[PDB]
Amino acid sequence: NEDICFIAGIGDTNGYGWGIAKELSKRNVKIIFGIWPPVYNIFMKNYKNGKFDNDMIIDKDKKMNILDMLPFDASFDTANDIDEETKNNKRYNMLQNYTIEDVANLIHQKYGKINMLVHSLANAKEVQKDLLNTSRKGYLDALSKSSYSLISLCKYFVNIMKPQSSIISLTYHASQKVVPGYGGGMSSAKAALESDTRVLAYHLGRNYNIRINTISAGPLKSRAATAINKLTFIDYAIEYSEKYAPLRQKLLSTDIGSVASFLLSRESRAITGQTIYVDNGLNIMFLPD
Amino acid sequence: NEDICFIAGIGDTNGYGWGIAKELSKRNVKIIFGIWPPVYNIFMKNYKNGKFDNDMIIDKDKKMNILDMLPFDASFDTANDIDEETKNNKRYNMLQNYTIEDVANLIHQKYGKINMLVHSLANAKEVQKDLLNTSRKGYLDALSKSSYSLISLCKYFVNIMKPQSSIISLTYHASQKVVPGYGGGMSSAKAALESDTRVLAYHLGRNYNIRINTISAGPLKSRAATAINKTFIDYAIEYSEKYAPLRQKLLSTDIGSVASFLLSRESRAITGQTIYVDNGLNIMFLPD
Amino acid sequence: NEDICFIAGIGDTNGYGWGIAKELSKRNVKIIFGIWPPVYNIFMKNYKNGKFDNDMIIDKDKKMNILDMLPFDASFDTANDIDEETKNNKRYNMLQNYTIEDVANLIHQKYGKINMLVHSLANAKEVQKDLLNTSRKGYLDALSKSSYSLISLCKYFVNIMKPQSSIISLTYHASQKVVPGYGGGMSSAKAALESDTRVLAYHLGRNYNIRINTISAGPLKSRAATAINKLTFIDYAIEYSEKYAPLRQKLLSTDIGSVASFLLSRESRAITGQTIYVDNGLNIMFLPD
Amino acid sequence: NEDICFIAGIGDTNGYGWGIAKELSKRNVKIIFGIWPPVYNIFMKNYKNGKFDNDMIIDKDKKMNILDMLPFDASFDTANDIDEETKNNKRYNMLQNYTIEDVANLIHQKYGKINMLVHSLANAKEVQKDLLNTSRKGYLDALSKSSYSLISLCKYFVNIMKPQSSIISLTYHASQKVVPGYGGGMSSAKAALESDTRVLAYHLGRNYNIRINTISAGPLKSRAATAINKTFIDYAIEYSEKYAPLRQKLLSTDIGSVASFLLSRESRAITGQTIYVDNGLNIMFLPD
Ligand SMILES: NC(=O)c1ccc[n+]([C@@H]2O[C@H](COP(=O)([O-])OP(=O)(O)OC[C@H]3O[C@@H](n4cnc5c(N)ncnc54)[C@H](O)[C@@H]3O)[C@@H](O)[C@H]2O)c1
Ligand SMILES: NC(=O)c1ccc[n+]([C@@H]2O[C@H](COP(=O)([O-])OP(=O)(O)OC[C@H]3O[C@@H](n4cnc5c(N)ncnc54)[C@H](O)[C@@H]3O)[C@@H](O)[C@H]2O)c1
Ligand SMILES: NC(=O)c1ccc[n+]([C@@H]2O[C@H](COP(=O)([O-])OP(=O)(O)OC[C@H]3O[C@@H](n4cnc5c(N)ncnc54)[C@H](O)[C@@H]3O)[C@@H](O)[C@H]2O)c1
Ligand SMILES: NC(=O)c1ccc[n+]([C@@H]2O[C@H](COP(=O)([O-])OP(=O)(O)OC[C@H]3O[C@@H](n4cnc5c(N)ncnc54)[C@H](O)[C@@H]3O)[C@@H](O)[C@H]2O)c1
Ligand SMILES: Oc1cc(CCl)ccc1Oc1ccc(Cl)cc1Cl
Ligand SMILES: Oc1cc(CCl)ccc1Oc1ccc(Cl)cc1Cl
Ligand SMILES: Oc1cc(CCl)ccc1Oc1ccc(Cl)cc1Cl
Ligand SMILES: Oc1cc(CCl)ccc1Oc1ccc(Cl)cc1Cl
């Protein structure tokens, strides 16, 4: 009764955020979507015109229930951080309460305390460039949006969460092993996110009795994954994974969703600070056959 | 759905095996216990006498359903492998079909194909000596009983398992970081088990679509734990409860619920992994 | 003959930069110091007034030879990055050619190509705050100065280095395991630096035949280490290390120096992308005695 | 300074043992070879006949100085441990004092205390089977000969070593990541060796101030390498030279110079570590 989850980073039904929502919905968790303002209106219109109705089907006797859909920009910690230009930008100007602190405030006012938090977002202006050719601005952009955003979400949401709550994010193995193509400091940001997950596990665990983990997911053809193409990257990764992983089956977003759902529930009470691989075991291989 | 799990390594209700059994029971999984022969009759006697009745309560509605309880010795792959001294032992002489292969055949003959396998056992005759003073015989005993036994279990059990079945074992972080009193080559055996888990994941995944993972548990005051010296387990528990990120008592069923998840279809995309279930203790460097 | 090493991050004789210089000097490597402008003048005056003469003694029949001492600020990639305020700041206004590109240009013009590069610097405005209380600005500051600086040094110095050159930086185990007190996103920056070391190893190795590694050093009572005190941290770490490390001896900066010197020489030709622990084995322990 | 190193595991000049010997020789370290008895006489014969003369050249001025060459079997801890079948073997019958303890005593009696120890040997009778089809006897053989042998070497050699001495062994990344043809429990043995290296580092560091590390080498076309199947070693080398960050031929002396550094006082603050000497291949995820 009243498991409520905020999922930060959903833009359509093709990413891991949607897979996580669907699996949580199956367990009767109420879902709140945090949607980045550049794609918020297109998301809502698609939703309203029933474009997602097929994608919301679960048991065939069961359909996803979404409690709310909120504009959310993980770039901004508080209203005071929003630069005048963004505030007046065409896509932002008609939206309110979209900073990290404001969304936490909003959620709490509307629904009270929550017990489940999902960071399912990343961004990097220079993802198309190799690390060596990444500018300082681009690298800091990657760390700001992909890594720091997790820390800030935690700082503001822990006030609206019950003890024994659970927090997950999503990472990629390029943090630990070299993946050519994963540029722009994205590798660096995932390494930071994985290390920050431990440090946060310590603070949140001791001061709040809240857990935090990260899922290192295998390749999924999401909207963001396609934007790694330069001049494709995700097709190569998928093909390589389906060919060489211990488990040669197609990796689904709901495969990640059911792990997320376990880590968010009380069943994972003794697990915290961990990077959990959900990648058909690809990470354990050294040399291909 | 008619799931069956063989749990190898139950001697009483104070260890991880029991906790795993309880949590699986919540999911209506049928449970079969593999019990080490030296403690088989005492176990059956305590069970008959009702000593375990309270430990078997799953909640208001439910009692643990235990399908069967069989003698099982991981020292022996097949009937041919038992020596005369064991053949002649008081405790073994009155039992049979307790080698790894015999138990696979016996389960398959009685109940058919299973789909869940749990390795929750270890042994090391020189556990109380430090690695440097461990003999070759002692070291190889630790590896034989604590590591090779997992390979052999897999080798014989795959024949009686369904596709998409799942397997787990238990390990300890002494494989990766030094724990002074974890002697007798137990640290070595755990290191080998964690690596074996990967290699097996490759073979079982490609050839049978079967998953295997290992749970690295924090300290639990079980029978075997009380055998280690610095008492060791009392120190480990106090340290964990003082310094772990989550300052709560680690329960066998905390491991049980993770095991149950790893053994279900929910974790279909996870294989070859060491999953830490230790209140986050493994992430700490410097005690604060 | 003409092994030349640029050591970026030396402010006095109490840190690892000095230890590395001393060990390299023992192998007749010519040393160039890159000195942060806020402490450059005080460094030079101390040096001139012979305050370091004791510290430069090697064999007792041998004294360190320093080829040059250059103002260096790893915050700035090129002259064009320097903000008007810094340029006119009291401590910067009389200094020139101190950006990463300008120092590379300068070194090359003056001495030709070099074959050894040391990143021995870190910085974080909010090191005194726990990760959870670190602001976005502070976290980005830590990543900018401690992590990105390595990438930029590489990008500009690879043009002035010979094939088969070697590059090292210094890291700390807080990247992998939680160390309370190592705040301000310093942990996050070290995690990034260690992951960037791999990615760079790949690019530099393939395109230039240049190696790069990082040394994860144990605790040393350097000037920066003392600035971690809040309201001390380094005294605790030293005491803990001397008590519980497999090797219970005092960790010296020249202990790190002799490893650095090995990794910079041709003897380590087949080692790249690695994090090498020089910490009396402390990292291998789980529970104290 | 009068340094002496025992190198256990030299059979010819094509392996890592020889490379380590050569590089140490550059530093004027006196070298003692431990040679597996089945290949001892053939080795001595090739040496006498000058087959190794060119491989022994250190440069313009220097030839490798080899202090002694002794039969050494890591299967056996003491004289008591040899079975009748080995006692009776053609190759062994004409040799003696080749158990681990006997060799420590023999070296100490002839040359005094040493300060450097190299473990450069492995064996696994079922290397050509995959882990899942490896027998208990085969698995334990791999662990006995490839892992326990390091512990035993340390146990017997510490008595004859100086304080601040240093010890190294060789491992392979198959302990950490799956390499399909690395069978017979060799992956398990390497996992145990890397963990054992840590535990030993604790014991030897606190008790004797002695260091121990392990070098994880990339592929070298040695005698033993040619025993593995997918040829395996030909594939590994081609893959490494194509995908490693450094695209250069890995030489035994590339491992040698790192070994020499780890065995010197230069690395006094390094212990219990796995050091990768593989042209950076281990850092790659996806072949590009
Ligand atoms: N797709 C893969 O193959 C893959 C593999 C490993 C990890 N991941 C991780 O999973 C997570 C989700 O990625 P995805 O693959 O589902 O792609 P996706 O496009 O479905 O998810 C990215 C979402 O984040 C949102 N977003 C971007 N910047 C934001 C900001 N500042 N504030 C709020 N929202 C913002 C975007 O609108 C987008 O909807 C990412 O962290 C990614 O690194 C993905
Ligand atoms: N207890 C802890 O603190 C702890 C921490 C980490 C990991 N573990 C692991 O969890 C597993 C379960 O142990 P536990 O802690 O529940 O103690 P336990 O005594 O409850 O379980 C060990 C069981 O293994 C059985 N066994 C021993 N030798 C056997 C053989 N040759 N064949 C068959 N069975 C044999 C014993 O009868 C015993 O019941 C072990 O593998 C242990 O390494 C335990
Ligand atoms: N001291 C330790 O215990 C310890 C342990 C592990 C790692 N390290 C690492 O070793 C490295 C050196 O630290 P240290 O301990 O020798 O302290 P230190 O003060 O001797 O070294 C830091 C130096 O970097 C310089 N610096 C700071 N910002 C700079 C910039 N933007 N451009 C150029 N130079 C700048 C400072 O002037 C200072 O001299 C750091 O990377 C640190 O993280 C230190
Ligand atoms: N060759 C490679 O590609 C490679 C890669 C990584 C690690 N390694 C490791 O390097 C080490 C050296 O092997 P190598 O590659 O030089 O091959 P090698 O054949 O040159 O060395 C192995 C030696 O071990 C000896 N040996 C075998 N059983 C023995 C016993 N019971 N007692 C004493 N000696 C015994 C053999 O006589 C042989 O000379 C091995 O431990 C191996 O695991 C090799
Ligand atoms: O992390 C990712 C890892 C993979 C490996 Cl298959 C594919 C997509 C990913 O997600 C992103 C990658 C880059 C950027 Cl800029 C944003 C995002 Cl959400
Ligand atoms: O693996 C273990 C780790 C700990 C750390 Cl708390 C405690 C108990 C353990 O289990 C055993 C330990 C030694 C032996 Cl001989 C058998 C077993 Cl079942
Ligand atoms: O990295 C470090 C690790 C330790 C652990 Cl003993 C001590 C000092 C360190 O160096 C710094 C720490 C913080 C900041 Cl702001 C700058 C620097 Cl140079
Ligand atoms: O460890 C090894 C790893 C590789 C990967 Cl290139 C090649 C050779 C190796 O050495 C052995 C391998 C198997 C056996 Cl039975 C003995 C030895 Cl000495």
CA distances from B278 to A215, A274, B123, C138 (A): 18, 11, 21, 32
| A172 is annotated as an active-site residue | yes
Measured CA to CA, the distance from residue B166 to residue B116 in angstroms comes to 5
| β-pair partners for B114 | B161
Closest C-alpha to C218, from C193, C253, C268:
C253
Measured CA to CA, the distance from residue A16 to residue D84 in angstroms comes to 65
Burial C110-120 (b: 16+ CB within 10 A, else e): ebeebbbbbbb
Question: CB A87: neighbour CB atoms within 10 A?
Answer: 12
CA distances from A33 to A102, C238, D174, D230 (A): 14, 47, 43, 50
Task: Give the domain CATH number at B162.
Answer: 3.40.50.720
Chain C residues inside the 8 Å CB shell of A177: 198
- D49: burial class by Cβ within 10 Å (0-12, 13-18, 19+)? exposed
Q: Is A9 annotated as a binding residue?
A: yes
Which residues are CB-contacts of D26 (< 8 A; sequence separation ≥ 6)?
D58, D62, D260
Question: CB D177: neighbour CB atoms within 10 A?
Answer: 19
Chain C residues inside the 8 Å CB shell of A189: 192
Measured CA to CA, the distance from residue B27 to residue B204 in angstroms comes to 25
Two tokens at B49? Answer: 């006498």
Pairwise CB contact (< 8 Å): B202 & D180: yes
- Helix D136-143, helix B136-143: angle, nearest 10: 130
Compare CB distances from C180 to B179, B239, B288 and report the shortest one's residue: B288
Compare CB distances from B155 to D132, D189, D201 and report the shortest one's residue: D132
Which residues are CB-contacts of D45 (< 8 A; sequence separation ≥ 6)?
none
In the numeric block, the tokens 């995959």 are attached to: D130
Q: Are C104 and C70 in contact (CB under 8 A)?
A: no
Q: Which amino acid is at B25?
A: S
Chain B residues inside the 8 Å CB shell of A245: 205
For CA atoms C124, C130, C131, C137, the dihedral sign is negative
DSSP 8-class letter at D69: E
Two tokens at C160? Answer: 């002035």
In which element (H, E) is residue B25 found?
Answer: helix B16-26
Tell me which chains share at least 3 CB pairs under 8 Å with chain B: A, C, D
Measured CA to CA, the distance from residue B148 to residue B142 in angstroms comes to 9
Compare CB distances from C285 to B178, B236, B245 and report the shortest one's residue: B178
For CA atoms A221, A222, A224, A227, the dihedral sign is positive
Measured CA to CA, the distance from residue B52 to residue B58 in angstroms comes to 12
A220 Cα nearest atom in ligand 1: 3
Ligand 2 within 6 A of CB of B153: no
Which residues are CB-contacts of A96 (< 8 A; sequence separation ≥ 6)?
A71, A102
Pick left, alpha or beta for residue C8 (phi over 0 → left; psi -120 to 50 → alpha; otherwise beta).
beta
Catalytic residue, from D98, D172, D202, D243: name it. D172
Measured CA to CA, the distance from residue A193 to residue A169 in angstroms comes to 8
Q: How many residues are present in chain A?
A: 289
Pairwise CB contact (< 8 Å): D131 & B140: no
Q: Are D189 and D124 in contact (CB under 8 A)?
A: yes
The alpha carbon of D192 and the centre of ligand 6 are apart by a number of angstroms equal to 17
Two tokens at C85? Answer: 């305020």
Sheet containing B161-171: order of strands: B66-71, B30-35, B4-8, B114-119, B161-171, B211-217, B274-277
User: Which parts of chain A fold into alpha helices (H)?
Assistant: 16-26, 37-48, 84-88, 100-111, 136-143, 149-157, 186-208, 223-226, 233-244, 253-264
Closest C-alpha to C212, from C200, C224, C221:
C200
Question: CB D265: neighbour CB atoms within 10 A?
Answer: 12
B→D contacts (Cβ < 8 Å), by residue, are 77, 81, 130-136, 139-140, 143-144, 147-148, 151-152, 154-155, 175-178, 180, 185, 187-192, 194-196, 198-204, 272
Q: Angle at CA B142, nearest 5°, toward B141 and B146?
A: 115
Q: What is the CA radius of gyration of chain D?
A: 18
Closest C-alpha to C37, from C103, C101, C94, C79:
C94
Which residues are CB-contacts of A70 (< 8 A; sequence separation ≥ 6)?
A32, A33, A34, A35, A97, A98, A103, A106, A107
Closest C-alpha to D216, from C205, C273, C278, C261:
C273
Closest C-alpha to D167, from D2, D22, D8:
D8
| β-pair partners for D171 | D216
- Largest Cα–Cα distance in chain D? 55
- Helix A186-208, helix A136-143: angle, nearest 10: 30
Question: CB D67: neighbour CB atoms within 10 A?
Answer: 16
In the numeric block, the tokens 């050494």 are attached to: D72
Question: SS3 for A141?
Answer: helix
Question: CB A60: neighbour CB atoms within 10 A?
Answer: 6
Measured CA to CA, the distance from residue A182 to residue A216 in angstroms comes to 14
Closest C-alpha to A24, from A2, A5, A47:
A5
Closest C-alpha to C7, from C27, C26, C29:
C29
Q: Which amino acid is at B40?
A: Y
The alpha carbon of D98 and the centre of ligand 2 are apart by a number of angstroms equal to 39
The alpha carbon of A217 and the centre of ligand 5 are apart by a number of angstroms equal to 10
Which residues are CB-contacts of C132 (< 8 A; sequence separation ≥ 6)?
A151, A154, A155, A200, A203, A204
Ligand 2 within 6 A of CB of B122: yes
Closest C-alpha to C150, from C204, C109, C221:
C204
**Nearest residue on chain C to B174, alpha-carbon basis:** C286
Chain A residues inside the 8 Å CB shell of D174: 286
Question: CB A145: neighbour CB atoms within 10 A?
Answer: 18
Compare CB distances from B187 to D176, D190, D199 and report the shortest one's residue: D199
- Largest Cα–Cα distance in chain A? 56
Closest C-alpha to A272, from A188, A219, A201:
A201
Q: What is the CA radius of gyration of chain A?
A: 18
Which residues are CB-contacts of D123 (< 8 A; sequence separation ≥ 6)?
D74, D141, D142, D145, D146
In which element (H, E) is residue D68 found?
Answer: strand D66-71
Q: Are C7 and C34 in contact (CB under 8 A)?
A: yes
Q: Which amino acid is at A117?
A: L
Measured CA to CA, the distance from residue D104 to residue D77 in angstroms comes to 11
Q: Are A34 and A70 in contact (CB under 8 A)?
A: yes
Measured CA to CA, the distance from residue C74 to residue A275 in angstroms comes to 32
Which residues are CB-contacts of C172 (< 8 A; sequence separation ≥ 6)?
C179, C182, C186, C190, C216, C217
Two tokens at C170? Answer: 């210094």
Ligand 1 within 6 A of CB of A187: no
User: Which parts of D112-210 fold into alpha helices (H)?
Assistant: 136-143, 149-157, 186-208
Measured CA to CA, the distance from residue C179 to residue C278 in angstroms comes to 17
Measured CA to CA, the distance from residue A113 to residue A157 in angstroms comes to 9
Q: Which amino acid is at A48?
A: K
For CA atoms A227, A230, A233, A235, the dihedral sign is positive
Number of independent structural domains in chain A: 1
Question: SS3 for A3?
Answer: coil
Question: CB D108: neighbour CB atoms within 10 A?
Answer: 16
Tell me which chains share at least 3 CB pairs under 8 Å with chain C: A, B, D
The alpha carbon of A267 and the centre of ligand 1 are apart by a number of angstroms equal to 26
φ, ψ at A252 (rounded to 5°): -100, 150
Q: How far is the first Cα of chain D from the last one, in angstroms, to the nearest whole number?
A: 48
Minimal-distance CA residue to ligand 6 atom 6? B219
In which element (H, E) is residue B41 found?
Answer: helix B37-48
Instruction: Give the structural domain span for D12.
Output: 1-288
Q: Angle at CA B163, nearest 5°, toward B159 and B168?
A: 80
Which residues are CB-contacts of D249 (< 8 A; sequence separation ≥ 6)?
D241
Closest C-alpha to A119, from A152, A142, A92, A96:
A152
DSSP 8-class letter at A33: E
The alpha carbon of D33 and the centre of ligand 4 are apart by a number of angstroms equal to 13
Measured CA to CA, the distance from residue A88 to residue A97 in angstroms comes to 14
Q: How many residues are present in chain D?
A: 288
Ligand 8 within 6 A of CB of D10: no
Which residues are CB-contacts of A179 (< 8 A; sequence separation ≥ 6)?
A172, A173, A187, D285, D286
Pairing of strands C114-119, C66-71: unpaired
Closest C-alpha to D74, from D169, D208, D4:
D169
Q: What was the elucidation method?
A: X-ray
In which element (H, E) is residue B258 found?
Answer: helix B252-263
Question: CB B42: neighbour CB atoms within 10 A?
Answer: 13
| β-pair partners for B31 | B5, B66
Pairwise CB contact (< 8 Å): D177 & A284: yes
| β-pair partners for C31 | C5, C66
In which element (H, E) is residue A30 found?
Answer: strand A30-35
Q: Angle at CA A217, nearest 5°, toward A216 and A222?
A: 140
Pairwise CB contact (< 8 Å): B284 & A202: yes
Question: SS3 for B99?
Answer: coil
Measured CA to CA, the distance from residue A187 to residue A131 in angstroms comes to 8
Measured CA to CA, the distance from residue B245 to residue B263 in angstroms comes to 26
Two tokens at C282? Answer: 């402390």
Two tokens at B53? Answer: 């009745």
Q: Are B218 and B250 in contact (CB under 8 A)?
A: yes
φ, ψ at D210 (rounded to 5°): -110, 140
Measured CA to CA, the distance from residue A112 to residue A1 in angstroms comes to 13
Two tokens at B73? Answer: 């010795």
Question: CB A223: neighbour CB atoms within 10 A?
Answer: 12
**Best B73, B132, B203 residue to mutate vs chain D (most D CBs within 10 Å):** B132
Closest C-alpha to C286, from B216, B194, D271, B174:
B174
DSSP 8-class letter at D148: I
Question: SS3 for B129?
Answer: coil
Q: Are B145 and B33 in contact (CB under 8 A)?
A: no
**Best A82, A99, A129, A131 residue to mutate vs chain C (most C CBs within 10 Å):** A131
Question: SS3 for D113?
Answer: coil
- B139: burial class by Cβ within 10 Å (0-12, 13-18, 19+)? buried
Quick one: three-class SS letters along chain C?
CCCEEEEECCCCCCCHHHHHHHHHHHCCCEEEEEECHHHHHHHHHHHHCCCCCCCCECCCCCECCEEEEEECCCCCCCHHHCCHHHHHCCCCCCCCCCCHHHHHHHHHHHHCCEEEEEECCCCCCCCCCCHHHCCHHHHHHHHHHHHHHHHHHHHHHHHHEEEEEEEEEEECHHHCCECCCCCCCHHHHHHHHHHHHHHHHHHHHHHHCCEEEEEEECCCCCHHHHCCCCCCHHHHHHHHHHHHCCCCCCCCHHHHHHHHHHHHCHHHCCCCCCEEEECCCHHHECCCC
Chain B residues inside the 8 Å CB shell of D154: 132
Measured CA to CA, the distance from residue A30 to residue A118 in angstroms comes to 13
Pairwise CB contact (< 8 Å): A196 & C175: no
* Ligand minimally distant from the alpha carbon of residue A218: 1
Residues in chain B preceding a C-to-N separation beyond 2.5 angstroms (breaks): 230
In the numeric block, the tokens 């992994």 are attached to: B273
Measured CA to CA, the distance from residue B73 to residue D97 in angstroms comes to 39
For CA atoms D10, D16, D20, D25, the dihedral sign is positive
Measured CA to CA, the distance from residue B71 to residue B92 in angstroms comes to 9
PDB resolution in Å: 2.2
Q: Are C235 and C160 in contact (CB under 8 A)?
A: no
Measured CA to CA, the distance from residue D210 to residue D162 in angstroms comes to 8
Pairwise CB contact (< 8 Å): C151 & A131: yes
